[PDB]
Design brief:
homodimer, alpha/beta, H-NS DNA Binding Protein, 2 domains, eight-stranded parallel barrel, binds copper (II) ion
Chain lengths: 312, 312
C-alpha cells in the first residue's frame, strides 16, 4: 500500500468533452452509478459557470451519496463564496497559469483562509495549472508554503505532455516538501498516450488520489480513463482493487457514458472494447485451452465481460 | 539522440487483430503507404502459417520498398528454412515460453547459425517471449550469450502488464550485457494502457527499435499504435520526428486500416480522433485566440488535421 482513491471528474472534466451535454438527470444518474461502484470522490463543474452549473452542484452535493462531492474552481475569493454556498464537501482550487512567489502564496492563502472560516468542514485541495512545465523551484516554494493550510495538493499535466519518469520525480519532490500528512492528487491528460502510465507512476511516488473520467472523456482526447486505470492497478493490487470497487459494473458505466455523449466505445477500449479479450494466434489458442491466464492480463469475468476465440 | 527506428507490424501483429482479413493487395497497399511515410521496417506474418502467408511474404519482400521487410518466426530450424527462402531482408526470432540455460542458448545459436550460413545478408533479431516476466538472471544469461551472433535483441511485453519503470530498468540491464553494438527492440501490448509510455521508456533506456501497428491493432487490445507513439516522440524530438516521417500522412494511414478491418477510428484516438483537438472551456478558448500553443501539445497542421473550438 500503495493506498489511494479515485476522484471521478466525469461531471467536471467531463463536461468539457466536445459532445457532452449532461442534463441534471444525466449527472444524477452518473453520480449514483459511480457511488454504487464505490468511487470515493465526484468532482463537478464550477458553480460559477452558469446557473445551471450551480444548481447541478447543489443537487449533486445533497444527493446523500457515500462519495464526497467536490467542486473545481479558479483560486479566487468570489468563486470560493459561490462554492461554499453550494454545500459541496470539498473544493478543488486551481491557481491558473512571471509574478512574485510571496504574492502567489499570499493570494492562495487568502482564498483558503476564507473557506476555512466560512466552511471549516469543507476539504480543500490546491493545484497550480500546468504543474510539470512550471519552473520547479518556484512551484515547490508555492506548494510548500500552501500545504500546511490545505488537505491536499494536486499536480496537473494540463496539456498531456508529461513523461512517466518526470511525473514520478516531481511527485516525489512534492511529497518531500509537503510532508506525509498532506494528500497528493494527480490529474493527467492523454495527448501523448501517457495518462494511465503517469497516474500509476504518481501513485508509486506517493500520490494518494488519481483523477479519472469514464471512458477518459474530457478536453481534447481526455484524461486518465477509469477502466484503463483500473486494469493497470488491478494487475498490481488485485485484492485491494476488487475489494474497493464493484468491478463487474465497468461495462455498464462505459455504456451509460458512451450513450449519453454519443460515441461508440472504442473497439480497443480497455476491458470493455469489442476486442479487449480476443485471441487469434494458434499458439495463443493452444495455451488458453490449458490455461486462459497464459495470455490474459486479468480475468474477463472480474470485470463482467467474456473472452473471444478466433479459430479461423 | 535518442536515435531509433520503427518496426511496423501491421502485417504481422497486425493480422492477429480479431477483424483483420488482409488480401495480398491490402498488404501491398499498406506496405507502400508505410514506405512512403518513411517507416524503416515492415514485419510480416510467418511464412509457415499458410501458403498464403508465404506468398504474401515473398511479394512484400520483393516490392522494392526502401523499408526492410522482415518476417517473424518461432525460433526453429524448420521455420528458418522457409523464412530465408522467402527473400525477406530480416528474420525476427521469437523463443517461445524450466529447461536449462546452456540448452536454450544451444538451440538459439543453432537457428541463428543456420541463417548466417544460408543467408549471410539477412538481419537477425532474437527475442524471448514474455521477457519482463521471465526470471531475470536466466533471461540476461541467454541474451548475453546470443547477442554476439545477432544484429538485434528484442524484449516483448506479451501480456501487456509491464510497468514503465520496469521496462526502463530491464532495457538498461540488457544494454549493459549486450554492449553498444547490438540493437535493442521493444514490443509492448496495451492491456494496461502503458504501450506508448513503455516504448518511450525503452528508448530512454537505450532501445533503438520500437514495434508499432497502425491504430495499435493486434492481439486483444493491440500494441503501441503508430500515431500515439509519434505524438509522444514528437513532443520530445520534434525536429527529428518531422524529418524522419511524412507526418501529414497519418490521417490517411489510420483511415486506410480502419476501413480495411471494419472499425471506426476511436473518438479519442491520438491526433486523428474526432475529439483530439477539440477545445471547450472558456479559459482555454480565451488563450487559444492569443495562442493555440497554450493548450495544444503539438500543432494539428503537422499531422494534417485541424482544431475545433466549441463556443457553447
Ligand atoms: Cu484537465
Ligand atoms: Cu504481440
Amino acid at each position: 500500500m500503495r493506498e489511494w482513491k479515485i476522484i471521478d471528474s466525469t461531471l467536471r472534466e467531463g463536461e468539457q468533452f466536445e459532445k457532452a451535454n449532461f442534463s441534471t438527470q444525466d449527472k444524477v444518474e452518473i453520480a449514483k452509478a459511480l457511488d454504487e461502484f464505490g468511487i470515493e470522490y465526484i468532482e463537478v463543474t464550477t458553480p460559477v459557470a452558469s446557473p445551471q452549473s450551480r444548481k447541478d452542484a447543489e443537487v449533486l452535493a445533497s444527493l446523500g451519496l457515500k462519495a464526497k462531492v467536490v467542486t473545481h474552481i479558479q483560486c479566487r475569493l468570489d468563486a470560493a463564496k459561490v462554492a461554499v454556498e453550494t454545500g459541496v464537501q470539498g473544493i478543488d482550487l486551481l491557481f491558473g497559469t512571471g509574478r512574485d512567489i510571496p504574492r502567489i502564496i499570499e493570494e492562495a492563502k487568502e482564498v483558503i483562509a476564507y473557506i476555512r472560516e466560512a466552511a471549516p468542514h469543507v476539504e480543500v485541495r490546491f493545484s497550480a495549472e500546468d504543474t510539470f512545465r512550471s519552473e520547479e523551484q518556484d512551484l515547490l516554494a508555492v506548494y510548500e508554503a500552501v500545504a500546511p493550510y490545505v488537505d491536499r495538493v494536486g499536480l496537473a499535466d494540463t496539456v498531456g505532455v508529461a513523461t512517466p519518469r518526470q511525473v514520478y520525480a516531481l511527485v516525489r519532490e512534492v511529497r518531500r516538501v509537503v510532508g506525509p500528512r498532506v494528500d497528493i492528487e494527480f490529474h493527467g491528460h492523454n495527448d501523448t498516450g501517457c495518462a494511465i502510465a503517469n497516474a500509476y507512476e504518481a501513485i508509486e511516488a506517493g500520490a494518494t488520489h488519481v483523477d479519472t473520467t469514464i471512458l477518459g472523456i474530457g478536453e481534447r482526447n481526455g484524461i486518465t480513463p477509469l477502466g484503463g486505470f483500473l486494469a493497470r492497478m488491478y494487475t498490481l493490487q488485485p485484492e485491494y482493487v476488487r475489494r474497493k470497487y464493484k468491478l463487474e459494473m465497468l461495462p455498464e458505466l462505459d455504456r451509460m457514458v458512451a450513450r449519453m455523449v454519443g460515441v461508440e466505445i472504442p473497439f480497443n477500449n480497455y476491458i470493455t472494447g469489442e476486442t479487449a479479450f480476443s485471441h487469434k494466434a494458434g499458439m495463443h489458442l493452444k495455451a488458453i485451452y490449458i490455461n486462459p491466464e497464459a495470455y490474459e492480463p486479468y480475468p474477463p469475468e472480474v470485470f463482467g465481460v467474456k473472452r473471444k476465440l478466433i479459430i479461423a
